[PDB]
């Protein structure tokens, strides 16, 4: 997570996808219906 290669696929057309983003769901704020989460930002964008 947070590093180049965090999400991977063998080919551009593959449906076989590996991902490690450490996605964790958080409790919604009181009085709201939103779904908060904590996830490592794409390592691809960081790499660029």
């Amino acid at each position: 997570p947070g590093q180049f290669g965090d999400i991977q696929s063998r080919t551009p057309e593959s449906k076989d996808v590996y991902a490690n983003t450490q996605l964790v769901l958080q409790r919604p704020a009181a009085g709201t219906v939103h779904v908060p989460y904590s996830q490592a930002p794409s390592g691809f964008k960081y790499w660029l």
Partner: protein, 98 residues
């Protein structure tokens, strides 16, 4: 780049929501208790107690991967080639060869 998919939340009041494991690339679901969500016109539902909410999300490749991506290759050997200019008997001839 990946996109995170987050389907609408399921709000179940006066009861407990449940979910099952999926085989998606990176997926999780959690049920939160003691939730009392509101909508623009008032409280989401009649019950103000023993309420739960089910949240779930998964990671998948974005549509942009058709254009913006980086390819990881293994290298082994290389084929050499050259463009050579030869002056032969006064004539400058350019020939391409491996």
């Amino acid at each position: 780049e990946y996109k995170t998919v987050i389907p609408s939340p399921y709000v179940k009041c006066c009861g407990t929501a449940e979910c099952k494991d999926k085989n998606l690339p990176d997926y999780s679901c959690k049920v939160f208790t003691g939730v009392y969500p509101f909508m623009w016109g008032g409280a989401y539902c009649f019950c103000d107690a023993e309420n739960t909410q089910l949240s779930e999300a998964h990671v998948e490749k974005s549509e942009s991967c058709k254009t913006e991506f980086a390819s990881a290759y293994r290298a082994h050997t290389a084929s050499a080639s050259a463009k050579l200019r030869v002056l032969y008997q006064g004539n400058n001839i350019t020939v391409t060869a491996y």
